[PDB]
């Protein structure tokens, strides 16, 4: 089946020009369409038939298609252009979409996360459950890596971490959970949630008290 | 031009569902129509195509034999019969308009799209949450401010809402997006930051509401 | 005349698309005209397959 490839993410400063790629074995022979999708919204057509714009779409958008690559270009990228951009084509009685490129517009200064770590409640332990809650807020750009440790040792089992979410003030929030047994929780002397962002790292620690 | 989907809901693997789409604002009898779906947090996947007079129908390999596209041009409606549903059919289903000429003739894009209707296919049954307190501590004391919260654990399906002091406390409240565990149940947390100087004197209650299971929970969070 | 340009011309003159030959894509050089193959005059236009139900042929000029 025909595959259209795309880079997962692109980041651009306001006023710079953004370029979103889209590969295909001989995509030049096909008409390409481009769709813009903002969080919580339906996609919207921004390019049909390689370069034509559905009037309703600013002139700073423009697209090309030659050989094996179609290219959506956003010159003078505004903040309101932050979104996911999907390429599309027609093949074997099928519509084919690319994986989508999430274009981030760095319209805010870097902000490092605040990390809050709670141990399991006494109530939950009486339910023979143990959940460590690590809450990550007020960071920008919207990317963090989370790492759990038990007595210093990396823990990967029982970890569930959300993707970042824009909060009211256009910063990002995320949460990470570590599920344990009450016996595991009490067997170790401390647990740790370590959050990395723009190279800088923050780590909190709890222990059975 | 508007395309209004309906019929979405929750169902279990093996079940069946019928989506609808009522079109207005254009001549329905001259446009081909499509269904496109999108798994939560993932990409777009086309599903099926139907020509203006239903003489040309196409399905993606992933749905051929299980879903059936249909339309009733006198009722300006587009349907999708979904049978033998699977977990990975969990997605938002968009009804989106095709071209006024056949896609083989260049009219091979999709415009406009609808707001969509959600279809969750899951083995899990509706269940209300257990609500546990995230108590303030020395480790939660940021100096001047302090943080406390509520863990809303093991509910299905989305959503739950969290207020603090039944809505009086709005400043410093952060309710986080829910995570989905292997068990198939959701969990989320709501944290509120408050003055550390009054944790012993002021009362904080989180009010959790899970409309799907008609569960309301009030949990006081104290040090 | 690329297959892209023929299709582009198709979409532009679709409202005038008929069994009677179209005017020509260009005034200068080599272009294309198109029409609905007579056996397909009854089909709705979004159900005309490009390969079967639409006739093309070159429109040679200077």
Query: Quick one: three-class SS letters along B209-220?
Result: EEHHHCEEEEEE
How close, in Å, is residue A85 to chain B by CA atoms?
10
Angle at A88 between CA C47 and CA B117, to 5 degrees: 80
| CA B101 – CA C11 distance, rounded (Å) | 7
Backbone angles phi, psi at B211, to 5 degrees: -55, -40
Alpha-carbon distance values, B195 to A167, B89, B131, B136 (Å) = 22, 47, 23, 11
Q: Where are the domains of chain A?
A: 9-105, 114-206
Cβ atoms of residues A83 and A97 within 8 Å = no
Instruction: Label residue C12 exposed, middle or buried (CB < 10 Å: 0-12, 13-18, 19+).
Output: exposed
Q: Which residues of C touch B56 (CB under 8 A)?
A: 47
Class of domain A114-206: mainly beta
CB-nearest partner of B45 from A97, A124, A179 = A97
Q: Which of B21, B99, B18, A126 is nearest to C47 (CA)?
A: B99
Backbone angles phi, psi at B93, to 5 degrees: -105, 115
Query: Reported resolution in A?
Result: 2.3
Local structure of B90: helix, strand or coil: coil
Phi-psi sector, B84: left (phi>0), alpha (psi -120 to 50), beta:
left
Q: Which subunits sit against A, judged by 3+ Cβ pairs under 8 A?
A: B, C
| CA B187 – CA B48 distance, rounded (Å) | 34
Q: Which of B215, B192, B221, B217 is nearest to B207 (CA)?
A: B217
Angle at C23 between CA C20 and CA C26, to 5 degrees: 155
Q: Which residues of B touch A116 (CB under 8 A)?
A: 140, 147, 149, 191
Cβ atoms of residues B219 and B206 within 8 Å = yes
Cβ atoms of residues B70 and B59 within 8 Å = no
Q: Which residues of B touch A86 (CB under 8 A)?
A: 43-44
Alpha-carbon distance values, B8 to A151, A159, B15, B91 (Å) = 47, 31, 13, 10
Q: Where are the domains of chain C?
A: 1-62
- Chain A residue with CA closest to C11: the answer is A49
CB-nearest partner of B46 from A37, A97, A124 = A97
Check CB contact of A49 with chain C, cutoff 8 Å: yes
Which helix (H) or strand (E) segment holds residue C9: the answer is helix C3-12
Q: Which residues of C touch A50 (CB under 8 A)?
A: 4
Give the number of other Cβ atoms within 10 Å of residue B110's Cβ: 26
Cβ atoms of residues A73 and A67 within 8 Å = no
| CA A54 – CA A43 distance, rounded (Å) | 14
Domains A9-105 and A114-206 share a fold: yes
First and final C-alpha spacing in chain C? 14
Cα A181 versus chain centre, distance? 31
Show Cβ contacts of residue C2 under 8 Å, excluding neighbours closer than 6 positions.
Answer: none
* Token pair belonging to B5: 């989907």
Show Cβ contacts of residue A182 under 8 Å, excluding neighbours closer than 6 positions.
Answer: A120, A125, A128, A129, A130
- Chain C residue with CA closest to B31: the answer is C46
Give the number of other Cβ atoms within 10 Å of residue A125's Cβ: 18
Alpha-carbon distance values, B78 to A20, B5, B6, B53, B195 (Å) = 34, 9, 11, 12, 55
Cβ atoms of residues C56 and C3 within 8 Å = no
The β-bridge relationship of strands B117-121 and B10-11 is parallel
| CA A23 – CA A32 distance, rounded (Å) | 11
Cβ atoms of residues B132 and B122 within 8 Å = no
Show Cβ contacts of residue A21 under 8 Å, excluding neighbours closer than 6 positions.
Answer: A5, A6, A7, A69, A71, A101
| CA B164 – CA C53 distance, rounded (Å) | 66
| CA A74 – CA A71 distance, rounded (Å) | 10
Query: Can the peptide bond before residue A175 be classed as cis, meaning omega within 30 degrees of 0?
Result: no
Cβ atoms of residues C46 and B32 within 8 Å = yes
Half-sphere exposure of A121 (CA within 13 A, CB side): 22
Q: Which of B53, B77, B72 is nearest to B3 (CA)?
A: B77
For residue A88, list its beta bridge partners: A33, A97
Taking CB atoms within 8 Å and a gap of at least 24, the contacts of A183-190 are: A184/A130, A184/A150, A185/A119, A185/A120, A185/A125, A185/A130, A185/A132, A188/A150, A188/A151, A189/A151, A190/A150, A190/A151
Local structure of C15: helix, strand or coil: helix
Choose from B130, B179, B183, B219 for mutation: most chain A CBs within 10 A: B179
* Token pair belonging to B212: 């799907």
Q: Which domains does chain B have, with CATH numbers?
A: 2-121 (2.60.40.10), 130-221 (2.60.40.10)
Phi-psi sector, B14: left (phi>0), alpha (psi -120 to 50), beta:
left
* Token pair belonging to A195: 């959050």
Half-sphere exposure of B214 (CA within 13 A, CB side): 0
| CA B52 – CA A134 distance, rounded (Å) | 53
Angle at A145 between CA B175 and CA B182, to 5 degrees: 65
SS3 letters for B139-173?
A: CCECCCEEEEEEEEEEEECCCCEEEEHHHCECCCE
Q: What is the CATH number of domain A9-105?
A: 2.60.40.10
Q: Count how many pairs of residues, chain B against chain C, have C-beta atoms within 8 Å.
A: 50
Give the number of other Cβ atoms within 10 Å of residue A207's Cβ: 13
Give the number of other Cβ atoms within 10 Å of residue A176's Cβ: 24
Q: Where are the alpha helices (DSSP H) in chain A?
A: 122-126, 182-187
| CA A98 – CA A165 distance, rounded (Å) | 23
Which helix (H) or strand (E) segment holds residue C3: the answer is helix C3-12
Cβ atoms of residues C32 and C9 within 8 Å = yes
| A162/B176 touch (CB, cutoff 8 Å), yes or no | yes
Half-sphere exposure of B10 (CA within 13 A, CB side): 11
Which helix (H) or strand (E) segment holds residue C11: the answer is helix C3-12
């Amino acid at each position: 089946s025909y595959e259209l490839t795309q880079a997962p993410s692109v980041s651009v400063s306001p006023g710079q020009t953004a370029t979103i790629t889209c590969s295909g074995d001989k995509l030049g022979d096909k008409f390409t369409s481009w769709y813009q999708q903002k969080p919580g919204q339906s996609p919207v057509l921004v390019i049909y038939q390689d370069s034509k714009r559905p009037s309703g779409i600013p002139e700073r958008f423009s697209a090309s298609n030659s050989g094996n690559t179609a290219t959506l270009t956003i010159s003078g990228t505004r903040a309101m252009d932050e979104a996911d951009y999907y390429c599309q084509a027609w093949d074997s009685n099928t519509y084919v979409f690319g994986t989508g490129t999430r274009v981030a517009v760095l319209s805010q200064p870097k902000a490092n996360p605040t990390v809050t770590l709670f141990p399991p409640s006494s109530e939950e332990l009486q339910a023979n459950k143990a959940t460590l809650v690590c809450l990550i807020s007020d960071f920008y750009p919207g990317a963090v890596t989370v790492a759990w440790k038990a007595d210093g040792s990396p823990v990967k089992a029982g970890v569930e971490t959300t993707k970042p979410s824009k909060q009211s003030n256009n910063k990002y929030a995320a949460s990470s959970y570590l599920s344990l047994t009450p016996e595991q929780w009490k067997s170790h002397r401390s647990y740790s949630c370590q959050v990395t962002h723009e190279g800088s790292t923050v780590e909190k620690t709890v222990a059975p008290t | 031009v508007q395309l209004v989907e309906s019929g979405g809901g929750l169902v279990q693997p093996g079940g069946s569902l019928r989506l609808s789409c009522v079109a207005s604002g254009f001549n329905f009898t001259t446009y081909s129509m499509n269904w496109v779906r999108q798994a939560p947090g993932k990409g777009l996947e086309w599903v099926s195509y139907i020509s203006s007079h239903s003489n040309l129908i196409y399905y993606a390999t992933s749905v051929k034999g299980r879903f059936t596209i249909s339309r009733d041009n006198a009722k300006n409606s587009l349907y999708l019969q979904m049978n033998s549903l699977r977990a990975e059919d969990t997605a938002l289903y968009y009804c989106a308009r095709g071209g006024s000429l056949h896609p083989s003739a260049g009219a091979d894009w999709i415009d406009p799209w609808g707001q969509g209707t959600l279809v969750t296919v899951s083995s899990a049954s509706t269940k209300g949450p257990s609500v546990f307190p995230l108590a303030p501590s020395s480790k939660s004391t940021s100096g001047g401010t302090a943080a406390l919260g509520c863990l809303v654990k093991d509910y299905f399906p989305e959503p739950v809402t969290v207020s603090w002091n039944s809505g009086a406390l709005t400043s410093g409240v952060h309710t986080f997006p829910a995570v989905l565990q292997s068990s198939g149940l959701y969990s989320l947390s709501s944290v509120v930051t408050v003055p550390s100087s009054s944790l012993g004197t002021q009362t904080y209650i989180c009010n959790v509401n899970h409309k799907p299971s008609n569960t309301k929970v009030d949990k006081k969070v104290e040090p | 005349p690329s297959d892209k340009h023929i299709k582009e011309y198709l979409n532009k003159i679709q409202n005038s698309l008929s069994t009677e030959w179209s005017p020509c894509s260009v005034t200068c050089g080599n272009g294309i005209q198109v029409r609905i193959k007579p056996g397909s005059a009854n089909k709705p236009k979004d159900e005309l397959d490009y390969a079967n139900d639409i006739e093309k042929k070159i429109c040679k000029m200077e």
